[PDB]
Symmetry: C3
Subunit: 659 residues, 3 copies
């Protein structure tokens, strides 16, 4: 189970199973241990009041692939199959199951969130017989209890050449805020005259189904596909007609064309890859990380990943600095156009940030701690982060400047970067307070160490304000505009203090408290405010043991790894690399939970972190302050013979590292 | 009945009557055979789910002019009047009825969709008595069954000088998507003290009425008017108050001011005119075509005509390439500012085109086959054109470039033309596939010949892609912007094939099939990809026979006419000119149906086609690729002594043609 | 009661009491005569159909400060309190009440609409007992009858450090157009362990309450605060969560930080001030005028004041030319950034003005007589002003040009001023009619003298059209853009006529009618079309006695004052100054009603007028047509020893005047 491209599980154990996800940046499908079922489906961009937090949330959607298969009128179940296996092919996001039913037939089924068609899904089923048998196949559209006011439809779309049977449902999110349409069809190879008649049943309030029978002789392979389109009022004005239209189009494209297009898109994604020689487990793990990031983003959009991407409802689907600081930097280097989507998400919500600033008594743009559809604040009111954790504004500005540094796109800087950088700088200029010594303080925040609440002069926050102001001033110079000279004066005098031992103080109330996650250490990377090697080391020595083993998110150890790599300490770098995700894994596919021993995968934030430890740490790759990508000194784990990183920067460079 | 300015009908035959329309680009009113009634009223820009196609539709609206007239308490009906006549004055869009009631009085009534006031209507009624008589007059607001949740209101708006009685109705389209308000008033000449008291009855769930009596002595003329305002939530935030406000405004402007303004606007429209000497029927017919286009469009808006304009619900009020290719070119030459509205419709829906492209796996902007309020696809799901007829994107780009060529407005090119041209070119670049010989193919479309479904390399479609790409590249050069060099490379290598007989092949599966309408012939005009005269001729010879007499729309013969005019073949040109619309006519006003012997007027697309045959064909007028309007060789029908075309181009030129 | 900074009232008389307002540009709170109650609360930007006019309106909001106080379970009443006093401190918008309960304790309470936090309020309560006693305190959230579908909530927001109890209500405006959320908390000094337990009762459908008891020992002061946040769907997508979030944030900021920020903002506002020596009553009155303007506007927004600011539902909260011509000029001179908000209100509604123009048959932008949320017309239909009072378009243009003149901001001219000026000029170009002598007329308007309805060539209206056209042409020149030369030709020939006595004729039907308010006199100031002193004087002589004593708004005499000051006639200037507001005052705080002896304060329009009489009249300050602020000859009232005006223009100049 250490193929570098495939994750595999034998005989799923439902008592200890955490599904894997396939996704195209719009729809995500999470596996079930049960054959021919899926656990959960999630549509990006669709939010309503639901469960956790009393704020907007992703909504569990139609489990549109659910099928029941019977042989000779005997239902297939986990309990009467054998040789049952599941595999995820990360090369093309194909989830496949396979099993034997008694003495009758082998079943293989593969499903896909099609890469080119954001709202279309497909499952292909093959049955290979060892004896004569008749299958009954049923596709179920059960309206989840998250949705309401459902309607269940069925019709035949025909011409002289086809009969396309459409199983359609339409329903609402809990407050009526979004309308959801799903439309499914079966695709056969045998043509209109010979295809099975499709029956429709509507026996339940919350479920309807289409079904058919097929006699198959011994020694034959019978194939069929299920295509499904899932779309909402958040994506299109008339989701009902659009879903039908999409499934009909996909049906007439046909399995072969769909999968060819799908594969082309995935092949382009994997032109940026990380290859490790001498450690199969590392190789597979890093592939899983890349795969989940690629699955949970989409080029040419305004979508941004939640901390859990499309793996579920984790953190209500909300967007945090988890994007800008954690998932964005690796995507910027490998695929700038994915990064472009992430920052586009922020650019389009600049106006709601302006609104937030005004409501909280400030100038410019104040980005929310948690963001969703509108760009307004979405943090649950019970968390003081919503009101008080303000570094997110600086995080957005850092991302925006980085995007420009890497691409050199001055047109985008003028159209999008500068709006962001200017407004966010204006925020910080209004956020600081000058004291009697002419220093600038940022008081009463929640720190990046979120256990420290309502404290003053948080190191990380104050670091982001410095960068935000500096970068906005540089941006002005690039565009030939005059920037308020206050921005520089403030930046140069924002307080970052040291304790008597010379260690960066986390905040004004800080002595030796345990901390939730990296904060002061973030001034070294990614901010690069602290570049002195002895200072990096002292901060590392002092804080690295301040993060407890339990209930601490995967937003720490990856940075420790990167910083030890930069210091050229292989044993330390490798210790922290492994510690950042290996204690967080869930079976059977080594998905990453938020915390050690956690059970809430997939935490895509953690993946993005570790990916920087690999690319920026072991690879030595770094965003040069004067533009483009550079390489600094680095070390590999002892047991790594070669590290190869492809498709870096706009020149798409390959970096090879050996001992 | 061959006045060059008036269409007239004696004694309307209700068993065989197709009403004429008066319209101001916003409201259309379709005549009834019955006196003092109207058949149908349609409001542009208002769409909701309704009947045909399960998709958005124009909605039958309040027949706000319906009046009942009684003499000595005896209702006027078709059955008790005599000398009944109707006439449409195309000079000012006045529909007039006139009749005699027994021995008592002559009635004349004229109604108008006021040209300056998009939401206001007026009917003027004159009664000339031959004996003493008392009239009872009633104005009815019946809520059509297309609307729901109606409220019926009545009030008196007063000051010391006036009493303006308002009959008001407010209701909803089927799904609640639009709120509709209608407000009517009666205008008298005799002033507040002497005017009839107005009674209000609300006897039915779906109808209320205002009424009055008036004694008139023998030998006197008594005049009154009905003013009506009709508006929706699609046009204004508060339609209820806005309708009342408008009717009060119009009332205090008075009949005389309203008609003077109305006539000024119509006079401006007719400064661009076509005059034919030697054929009264041609003259009247071409006037009707101009009149319908002028009535169904409006300068300084973002409105675009449906194929049936405001003549009714035809094609659900949706916008098709019927605008860009068929109705737009004649309007661009005669009145550029009307063309500007047509393309503005598309510019404002550029975003919904981008959305469609992404949903179907493409870059840039993919315009919908059928468009309505949002700009999203509105083609009924049962018709495969929705998903597969793709030339519409190129049609929109061609229109946009043409607009620039004719006006020379480089500011508009930068602000509106280039956005369109760039996105649409990006679509085609993503739509083509390169083959092993370095040619580019466009596979799996429905052709302009819509009877050819799911075929490859449609001549017309491939023609539009070439033009779209070339024009986008030229546009880039004009604005000094760098365009992807791919656009030219692709354009130059898109496939256009010939069969062994040297005739342009319609598509890759094409041999000798009957075709719905012109396709390959369109490469000659309007695309002008084929300029070789022998090639034009061969394509004409081959395909002209391929269109059946039945169920083929009026989007063919007009092109045949134009192309024979260009070749200087008068007899052929004239045969096809007449064949394009004369077999499609409906009595008593010679309105045009979509197909030969059809019964679904008024097909404004057909009119636009024929108008190009006249202007571009017989007139020889042509949009020069380097800018402005030029004239190429042409011929007139034998029986036409003179053809005069006025107000052409931004220089407003007159073209005179004789044998 | 003539402190120059405080308005004060002893023993409020509920039978003759008009409350004063505290406001921050977003929320207004109007005082009650009763202790620890407020009369009315109004939220800017929230409109729905409600009562007057059948059109959108501000809505009575939660009286969120209402408290009941008891000693030893004996409620505070008028009948058992003594030295009851109220005071408004204009320095910081603090409304304070103070009183004695029997012989046992002194209570003071001060409330604030916090200047930095647009949606937050605070009341601070101090109780000093002279014997041991127990207070019961109750904060009531009664849902006003203006709102519907209310929900009453209560919860505890905690961490180890705090327990923040939230009393929250959510409700809807009459039609469901706006959702309103209010969330209150109590702030204690004594910390989490020792703070009173908070009880919650929900005994009524429309009222719930939080309460607590506290023992206070003899000779001790017990202090607590109430913080309230009031917000709607018009301000934020999720008002319910945002209100809770804001109150939590304010609570953790704490009273002291909030009042510090509050005071900083007020201190900046008062850096522009008017000081009079030798007339305490004048000084206090002019301070009240300034105070009300500062309270009813807000820098860095798109908010514009209604004629009654945030003092209540006066004129349904609608925006009129009352802003551009009456409130805007004094704010432009003193604080340009407040003026910038006023014109931003119009810039953001330019599109709805374009819509209105098209609906009424005109080009460009036609601003509504009455404006609210959308920018569409909101005048009640029963007032002919809505359809016919057209000078508002010119008024908006004049304001826009003035803004540029004073600031010199050419970036804003290009981005915002020119759009407005161009569209509005295009309106007038389409609005005029040329007659036989080559003059231009504007026919069928309601005049600025609104008693003149449906008349032609109103002096004021025609004056605004001249200015609008001239300013748009000048604006074009500044930006190097070509303007239609028709604008100048029209401007130069618009009709302004004189009667035989050489007096400016108000309109074409005008001889000697009484008039509602200044019209022809407005051509002298503000338009400055009439600069000849003898002409000014003759117009003044003829019209000044044409305004009746009764039911004439305060939009006349202040102009008379300014014009007599410009003529150097102190006795006349001073007569008209006092006449403009002194007969309009209401007790106990000298609030200004709309008309003499009126009872509908606070008419902020009137205040703006008088403030121009002071600044532009007595101060001689004037907007120079070539840019910046200048000073012309002027006179002071005899009894004024010195007039000092501070913070004028972008150079923030001080003007000092003596005899
Ligand atoms: O994953 C989202 C969120 N969880 C809590 C963490 O402390 C914070 O750093 C992160 O943004
Ligand atoms: O007129 C609407 C529509 N009808 C069908 C025709 O074939 C097509 O060309 C046209 O666009
Ligand atoms: O104060 C609002 C409105 N009331 C009536 C006045 O006549 C008018 O001039 C003013 O704009």
């Amino acid at each position: 189970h250490q193929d570098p491209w495939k994750l595999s599980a034998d005989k799923p154990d439902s008592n200890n199973y955490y599904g894997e996800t396939v996704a195209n940046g719009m729809i995500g499908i999470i596996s079930s241990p049960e054959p021919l079922k899926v656990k959960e489906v999630v549509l990006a961009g669709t939010y309503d009041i639901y469960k956790r937090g009393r704020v907007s949330s992703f909504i569990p959607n139609y489990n549109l692939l659910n099928m029941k298969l019977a042989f000779n009128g005997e239902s297939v179940q986990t309990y009467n199959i054998n040789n049952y296996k599941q595999e995820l092919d990360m090369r093309n996001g194909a989830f496949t199951g396979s099993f034997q039913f008694k003495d009758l037939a082998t079943v293989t089924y593969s499903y896909y969130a099609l890469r080119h068609l954001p709202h279309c899904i497909m499952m292909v089923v093959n049955i290979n017989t060892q004896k004569d048998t008749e299958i009954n196949v049923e596709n179920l559209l059960e309206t989840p209890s998250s949705l309401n006011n459902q309607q269940n439809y069925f019709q035949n779309i025909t011409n002289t050449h086809v009969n396309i049977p459409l199983l359609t449902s339409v329903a609402f999110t809990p407050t009526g805020r979004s309308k959801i349409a799903v439309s499914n069809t079966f695709l056969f190879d045998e043509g209109k005259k010979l295809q099975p008649e499709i029956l429709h049943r509507m026996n339940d309030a919350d479920m309807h189904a289409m079904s058919f029978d097929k006699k198959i002789k011994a020694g034959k392979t019978y194939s069929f596909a299920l295509i499904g389109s899932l779309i909402s009022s958040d994506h299109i004005n008339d989701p009902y007609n659009e879903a039908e239209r999409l499934t009909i189009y996909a049906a007439l494209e046909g399995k072969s064309r769909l999968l060819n297009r799908h594969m082309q898109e995935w092949n382009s994604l994997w032109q940026s890859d990380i290859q490790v020689e001498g450690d199969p487990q590392a190789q597979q793990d890093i592939r899983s990380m890349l795969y989940h990031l690629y699955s949970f983003t989409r080029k040419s959009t305004s979508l941004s990943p939640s901390p859990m991407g499309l793996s579920g409802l984790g953190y209500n689907g909300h967007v945090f600095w988890d994007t800008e600081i954690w998932m964005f930097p690796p995507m910027l280097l490998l695929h700038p156009e994915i990064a472009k989507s992430m920052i586009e998400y922020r650019y389009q919500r600049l106006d709601a940030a302006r609104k937030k600033a005004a409501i909280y008594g400030y100038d410019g743009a104040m980005f929310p701690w948690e963001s969703a559809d509108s760009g307004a604040e979405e943090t649950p009111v019970n968390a003081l982060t919503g009101a008080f954790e303000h570094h997110v504004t600086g995080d957005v500005a850092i991302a925006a400047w980085q995007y420009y540094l890497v691409t050199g796109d001055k047109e985008w800087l003028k159209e999008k970067g500068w709006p962001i950088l200017k407004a966010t700088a204006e925020f910080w200029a209004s956020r600081v307070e000058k004291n009697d010594k002419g220093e600038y303080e940022i008081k009463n925040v929640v720190a990046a160490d979120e256990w420290a609440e309502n404290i003053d002069n948080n190191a990380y926050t104050n670091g982001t304000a410095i960068r935000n102001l500096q970068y906005a001033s540089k941006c002005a110079t690039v565009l030939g505009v005059i920037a308020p000279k206050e921005w520089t004066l403030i930046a140069d005098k924002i307080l970052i203090s040291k304790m008597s031992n010379g260690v960066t103080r986390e905040h004004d109330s800080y002595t030796d408290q345990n901390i939730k996650q990296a904060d002061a250490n973030l001034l070294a990377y990614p901010l690069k405010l602290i570049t002195d090697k002895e200072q990096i080391e002292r901060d590392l020595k002092y804080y690295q043991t301040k993060i407890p083993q339990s209930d601490t998110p995967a937003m720490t150890q990856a940075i420790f790894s990167l910083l030890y790599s930069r210091l050229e300490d292989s044993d330390q770098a490798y210790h922290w690399f492994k510690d950042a995700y290996q204690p967080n894994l869930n079976p059977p596919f080594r998905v990453i939970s938020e915390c050690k021993g956690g059970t809430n995968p997939y935490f895509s934030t953690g993946a993005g972190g570790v990916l920087q430890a690999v690319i920026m740490g072991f690879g030595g790759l770094d965003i040069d302050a004067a533009g483009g990508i550079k390489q600094v000194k680095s070390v590999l784990p002892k047991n790594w013979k070669k590290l190869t990183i492809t498709g870096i920067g706009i020149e798409k460079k390959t970096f090879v590292l050996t001992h």
